[PDB]
Amino acid sequence: QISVRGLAGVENVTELKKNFNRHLHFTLVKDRNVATPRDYYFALAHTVRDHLVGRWIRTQQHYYEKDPKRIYYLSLEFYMGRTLQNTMVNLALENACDEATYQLGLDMEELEEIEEDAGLGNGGLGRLAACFLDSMATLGLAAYGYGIRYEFGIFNQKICGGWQMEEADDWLRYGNPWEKARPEFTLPVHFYGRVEHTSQGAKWVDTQVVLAMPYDTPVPGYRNNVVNTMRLWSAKAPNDFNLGYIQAVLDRNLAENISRVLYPNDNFFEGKELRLKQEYFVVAATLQDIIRRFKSSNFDAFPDKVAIQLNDTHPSLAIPELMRVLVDLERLDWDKAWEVTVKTCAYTNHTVLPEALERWPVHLLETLLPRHLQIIYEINQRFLNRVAAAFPGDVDRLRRMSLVEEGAVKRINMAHLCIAGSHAVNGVARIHSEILKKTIFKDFYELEPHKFQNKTNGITPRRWLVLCNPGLAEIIAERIGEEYISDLDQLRKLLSYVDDEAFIRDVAKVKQENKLKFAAYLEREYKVHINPNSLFDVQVKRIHEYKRQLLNCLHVITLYNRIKKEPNKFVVPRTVMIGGKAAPGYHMAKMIIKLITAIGDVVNHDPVVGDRLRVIFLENYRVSLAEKVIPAADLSEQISTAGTEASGTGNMKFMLNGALTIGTMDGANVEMAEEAGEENFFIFGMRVEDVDRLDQRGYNAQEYYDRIPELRQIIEQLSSGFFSPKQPDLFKDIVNMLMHHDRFKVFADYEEYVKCQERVSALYKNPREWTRMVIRNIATSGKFSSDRTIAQYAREIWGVEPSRQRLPA
Amino acid sequence: QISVRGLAGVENVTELKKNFNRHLHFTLVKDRNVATPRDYYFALAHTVRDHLVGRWIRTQQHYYEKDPKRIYYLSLEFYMGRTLQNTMVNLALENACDEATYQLGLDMEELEEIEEDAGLGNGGLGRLAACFLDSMATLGLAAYGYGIRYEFGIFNQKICGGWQMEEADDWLRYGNPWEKARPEFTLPVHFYGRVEHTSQGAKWVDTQVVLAMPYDTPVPGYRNNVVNTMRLWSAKAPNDFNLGYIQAVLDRNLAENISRVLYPNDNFFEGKELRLKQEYFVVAATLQDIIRRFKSSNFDAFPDKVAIQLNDTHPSLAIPELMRVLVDLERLDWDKAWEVTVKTCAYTNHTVLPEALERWPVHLLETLLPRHLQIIYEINQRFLNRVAAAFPGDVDRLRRMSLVEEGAVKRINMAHLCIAGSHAVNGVARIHSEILKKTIFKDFYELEPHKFQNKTNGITPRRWLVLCNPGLAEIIAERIGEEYISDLDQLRKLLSYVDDEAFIRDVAKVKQENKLKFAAYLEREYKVHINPNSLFDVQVKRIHEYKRQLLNCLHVITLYNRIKKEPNKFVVPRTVMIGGKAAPGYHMAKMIIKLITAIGDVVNHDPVVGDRLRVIFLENYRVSLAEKVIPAADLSEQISTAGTEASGTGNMKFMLNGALTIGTMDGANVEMAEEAGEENFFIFGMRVEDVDRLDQRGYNAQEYYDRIPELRQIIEQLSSGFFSPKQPDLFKDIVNMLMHHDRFKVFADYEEYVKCQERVSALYKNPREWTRMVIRNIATSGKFSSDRTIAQYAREIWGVEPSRQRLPA
Ligand SMILES: O=C(Nc1ccn([C@H]2C[C@@H](F)[C@H](O)[C@@H](CO)O2)c(=O)n1)c1ccccc1
Numbered sequence A, B: 001q002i003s004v005r006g007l008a009g010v011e012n013v014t015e016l017k018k019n020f021n022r023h024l025h026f027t028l029v030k031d032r033n034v035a036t037p038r039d040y041y042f043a044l045a046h047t048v049r050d051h052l053v054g055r056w057i058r059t060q061q062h063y064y065e066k067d068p069k070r071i072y073y074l075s076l077e078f079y080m081g082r083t084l085q086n087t088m089v090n091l092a093l094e095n096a097c098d099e100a101t102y103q104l105g106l107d108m109e110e111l112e113e114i115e116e117d118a119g120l121g122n123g124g125l126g127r128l129a130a131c132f133l134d135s136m137a138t139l140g141l142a143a144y145g146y147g148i149r150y151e152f153g154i155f156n157q158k159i160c161g162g163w164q165m166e167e168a169d170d171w172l173r174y175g176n177p178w179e180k181a182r183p184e185f186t187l188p189v190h191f192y193g194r195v196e197h198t199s200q201g202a203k204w205v206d207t208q209v210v211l212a213m214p215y216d217t218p219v220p221g222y223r224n225n226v227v228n229t230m231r232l233w234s235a236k237a238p239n240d241f242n243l244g245y246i247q248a249v250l251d252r253n254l255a256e257n258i259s260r261v262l263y264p265n266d267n268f269f270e271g272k273e274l275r276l277k278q279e280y281f282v283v284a285a286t287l288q289d290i291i292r293r294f295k296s297s298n299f300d301a302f303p304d305k306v307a308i309q310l311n312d313t314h315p316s317l318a319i320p321e322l323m324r325v326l327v328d329l330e331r332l333d334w335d336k337a338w339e340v341t342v343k344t345c346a347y348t349n350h351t352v353l354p355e356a357l358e359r360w361p362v363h364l365l366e367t368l369l370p371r372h373l374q375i376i377y378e379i380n381q382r383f384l385n386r387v388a389a390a391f392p393g394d395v396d397r398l399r400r401m402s403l404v405e406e407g408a409v410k411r412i413n414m415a416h417l418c419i420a421g422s423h424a425v426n427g428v429a430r431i432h433s434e435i436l437k438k439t440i441f442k443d444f445y446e447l448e449p450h451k452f453q454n455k456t457n458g459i460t461p462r463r464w465l466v467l468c469n470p471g472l473a474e475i476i477a478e479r480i481g482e483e484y485i486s487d488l489d490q491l492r493k494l495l496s497y498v499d500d501e502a503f504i505r506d507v508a509k510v511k512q513e514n515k516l517k518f519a520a521y522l523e524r525e526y527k528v529h530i531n532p533n534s535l536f537d538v539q540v541k542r543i544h545e546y547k548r549q550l551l552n553c554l555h556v557i558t559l560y561n562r563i564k565k566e567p568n569k570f571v572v573p574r575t576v577m578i579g580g581k582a583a584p585g586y587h588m589a590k591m592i593i594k595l596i597t598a599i600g601d602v603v604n605h606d607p608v609v610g611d612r613l614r615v616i617f618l619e620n621y622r623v624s625l626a627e628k629v630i631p632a633a634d635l636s637e638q639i640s641t642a643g644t645e646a647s648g649t650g651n652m653k654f655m656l657n658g659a660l661t662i663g664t665m666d667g668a669n670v671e672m673a674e675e676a677g678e679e680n681f682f683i684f685g686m687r688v689e690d691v692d693r694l695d696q697r698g699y700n701a702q703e704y705y706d707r708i709p710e711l712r713q714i715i716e717q718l719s720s721g722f723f724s725p726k727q728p729d730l731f732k733d734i735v736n737m738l739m740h741h742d743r744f745k746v747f748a749d750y751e752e753y754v755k756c757q758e759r760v761s762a763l764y765k766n767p768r769e770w771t772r773m774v775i776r777n778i779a780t781s782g783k784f785s786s787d788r789t790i791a792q793y794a795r796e797i798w799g800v801e802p803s804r805q806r807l808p809a
């Protein structure tokens, strides 16, 4: 139907149809008379999966023969979403499967909606890992993603009476056709026990054993016949476990609880024992697998054949675990072992918020991992000896840099452990990486400046354009060809079309079609009625105070109050959509969701407003929903307080898909504006330096309330019960926080934000000039492909060359 | 290679080879370079499974079109063993797969050993259910087996220092290629809650819900293209379950514990709540499935289209559950509902031992199943009104017949509930069925004589001859053809060969080959050295006092003592093998295992004995081990105290496979001896009437000890520490039980048993006359095919005609 979706040859279509029918009969054990749409989805998934296996076996055989340097990406989160369409895209099978299913009397898009998301992450950090796997395969790198196969991923969010409710995400209920269990490569992991010292070194004894069983999922590169592996570990009790009789069998559950559920708290550290067990479990099983594979090729060459990338500090125990194995089991001396470890490991930081840093109580490590605690103390002593030699007499530096934090409870700072034991430390956007060198890791940067790098985040143009926005991918390919899909810098060629009346019309037409599709989806699956001619104003991301969904709320109420003040005045109509999940224990985030729905309840039912303003809370935001709403957006809200969002990646998805951005100079927004030109971006608010000035002086929210009459009115409406008539004091916590305890200075950016929003509305009144600015954004989005990002990791950290060359089919 | 194993045609062999290679590549995702024998087993299992699915789909479609009366066999145990060879046998694929695998460079028998047993039962009752499924499919009946998919079946038994140790039977670890999950047919099951009375009847409210997810396994008939279904339910928590957050997800395990593990106690009732939940879970989900299927065809015709067979009282809650559904949900009046229930249900009793009867505490039923308790009280009241009208003034009869037992704790007698609510009640051998009418159910037989039947047990000649003893099946088919495999009465034709010198030699040759094979197996997999020329004397069955493994022990010690007394005298050499699992909490049974190994330790290492006597404990006895040892046996020990073993089925397996029987006149032994002729059986000991005489008088074990010098010596050896030098008093519990508290009168049968054993040894000295008696046994074993048994259930209980006609291929 459309060219970017590949060929639908007679031979291929014929073959797909017969393999579909074979799977329905032999694999699903059904006939057409009893088959449900879910059966049809599974028959299709099994048919596409068959096309992967040949390439998967030959890719792994090739790595064994050629023995390249292997890249191991360790993460506690992989936010993968759905797999069927992504696989078809990367294999050039989409049009053929479309034709084949059409001829069988089926609608492929309907079958695609049956697949569950693999929701094994919370947000940006987990989705980054997923984009990275796609780019590593597309660039022909010998890479493996290693994680945990959670039985329950991120909860499903229901909204009841305006409140978030959590439901278990039982994503494996119907089975997962993409994974292959490998019970034959099961490995033991040890917990508790104690340390014995012999003549021949330390011994970790009397441990409890949990088994780690791997499940492998294929990761196809874009049309290069490369298929890499994501290996996820599942916890199993050993068979002599606890072995009155009935209870001993039932208690096997205790061991298997390790892989049961993803912790849903992002940007807030809780020192729970089960989380620590999860972190060690992934690290210990992964490291045995790495060493196994290396021996099947003397540890001097270890860093030449192995790179380990730590996705934040979550897998930081890799550092002392690798030391444990090299020293205790392989009997290398300390200094040699340490050299190998440092050259092998590298660490990526994703936040500067203090409450998000992992600082584990020593008493936990003492009981659970007694040998690792001893290794950490020894690392600390030797590291601080170096600091002392470089900065003699600087006793406070020693306290600041220690891996051991003194106090009420002693803790281990995992970020300090990661810097000490890695040859490279990177932030995730230029501004973030600079803040690391100047503030939180300043001491470490002074000691070892060579370690610190930047690697600005990116997104995969496969999932985030071709898959989710085929209409836009097509009008682009018509002018410039198909090469941009794996070389996104080619989008620059589109600047020579900014005055092309045909292109302008095509860009605007694709956006309108996207909005109609999404406007209909809202009514079908959620029974809500929106005007598709309105400006689609969207903020989708996890709910946190720093992301300032509340500032968005203040603008919405301002617009409503202005309308009620002058009802017969013209305003540009808007549909304001906000979505995202809150962490189950985060009270303020749950209150913000309730406020948004409460505003909707008032605004959406005021007859004087008409269809000039609508406020929609988008329920259960997740990867598959993102693929729908992002192509439909006109305005992307990226309004975190300057200095708080390390990079952002949602921002990049919106830029690629033809939305304009309103945002602060924070995270990757700075580089986006630099690429597109500041004239083509809606920048507002305090810069980082302005925030610091305000902190030195002292932030007084009262000053703003006193001097801005429009802001005062809103606060009075909130306090008095305007948005909660039956429960007048419902929002008192929100008002109190805003007035007296606001870490993120919502009031301070209010005036400039409202002013900037007026400028957005002004441009939207001129469709032709709106679209020309859109083209300037899409055309300059090339830097933000994760192919660029991964190529920089490869060259500057891992020491390997990317390859765009195909393997034989 | 051998004719009974079918054809190996060029076309078939070619096809099997290519489908094997396809499964290895696409299903297992391996090449030949990395494949292990387990991979090869799975590729073969998937290849054979493909041949079932066509017939499975068309069998079930046929039942929908023709709408026959459906038979539902409810059991908490299905002791299935391995599936691969059984499937090949029933599909006539064995020789072809043998050829195909040979040509691929593989040994099929080696791959067969990789499959795990489906150990979802304890012993005779569970294995009977498995033989029954095979016979129902072979006789073309529209039958479904319904049970629980336990994650852990009967424990694996290890012997450590002579003691039994239990290990979890993690049989699903590598996957089960035979089952198909059907998450689409998931059904809710309710627990706890309370009863409300409305104007329109009772309502069961405020319940906790557990989901029941079915898994279907194919059951192929013997070469008739019929494939029936065994549907096993798995427990799942609902997704809003318990829905701080982390714990609520982890607590889902509580619900899912219902299907976690098989209770390993046979013949001893424990009133554990988890067991009650298991019993209701299977009944509630099964009954919804039955009704669903019936509606897709007015409840008057219900008994015309449905039969429910209760395998003991374990699924007895079907009776009040069916009443609950018909009265509370369908709104039938009580009397009509009861008529339907009685005509639908039938009950099979498997034991007379008082401690095995299910008598559930009323307080358990009150809390867990409040509505069912009310229904049971109402059933009881109406039943006792009938007893009172038939036997006016007989107040003690009313107490004896009540479903409610009075006392310390009130209990419900589930056996009484089953008789009241079933149109048929049967025992499992003629002697057992007579004991039911004369003793434990005498009152019920007087009230409703028409309800009571006999159905003597049987075994399937597919698993228990063709599969496990192909050598014997072949020499038989050479003379009389292949028809006997589904018409076992044809074995009578073999009587005309009792004087045939060629046949005599062939029968003896097959036995010797079986013994050599098993003698080698013992050395390979268990490093133990036996003489294959010795008489193989075997007792394999679950360990219980009533089965009298201890009497066997007394004989063994007698033989050892006689040898030591006159070392240079000739005796017929024996290998005495005893095997079977003990229930984890049964102390005496665990002591008996230790005694057997302790005797072995002394006997097997006495240089004066030589290889004239060996005592072997066969570890981890289970279905796959039975298939090995039974064809190797010369002597079958069936020596329960008269009146205690309801039928036995192991006895029948040994008779079919060319062992002679030493046994009491108990259970089916009586009918076996009647079929073969008493001259061709080694019968000894008290009859039932002799046991009763002894009970009236009072059993005094001292009298035997005082009057039998050989018995006194053994007891003195046991007490003094002869068999436990380092632990002289180890066996004091055993001696005390024998001397003062022996319910099963071991001493009373001792003299006659030893005498009878001398007669066995005498016949074994004359190989030709031994074999002629063997032929007379095999020739008269036809009555004990489960095809005969199932045909009687069909005609006399279920009201359906068996059919040997094929479905189209
Ligand atoms: O800080 C935690 N979890 C985080 C931290 C940062 N991030 C984001 C921030 C965003 F700027 C960036 O674009 C994205 C990819 O780099 O990472 C995120 O998604 N989860 C955390 C995790 C577990 C426990 C406690 C805190």
Ligand SMILES: O=C(Nc1ccn([C@H]2C[C@@H](F)[C@H](O)[C@@H](CO)O2)c(=O)n1)c1ccccc1
Binding pocket: B122, B123, B124, B125, B126, B128, B265, B266, B267, B268, B269, B270, B350, B351, B356, B357, B428, B457, B645, B646, B647, B648, B649, B667
């Ligand atoms: O009595 C119980 N469990 C039994 C009872 C009898 N049986 C056997 C006895 C045997 F004679 C017969 O051949 C075979 C088939 O009919 O059944 C058996 O294998 N389990 C029981 C079960 C659960 C809890 C408590 C007791």
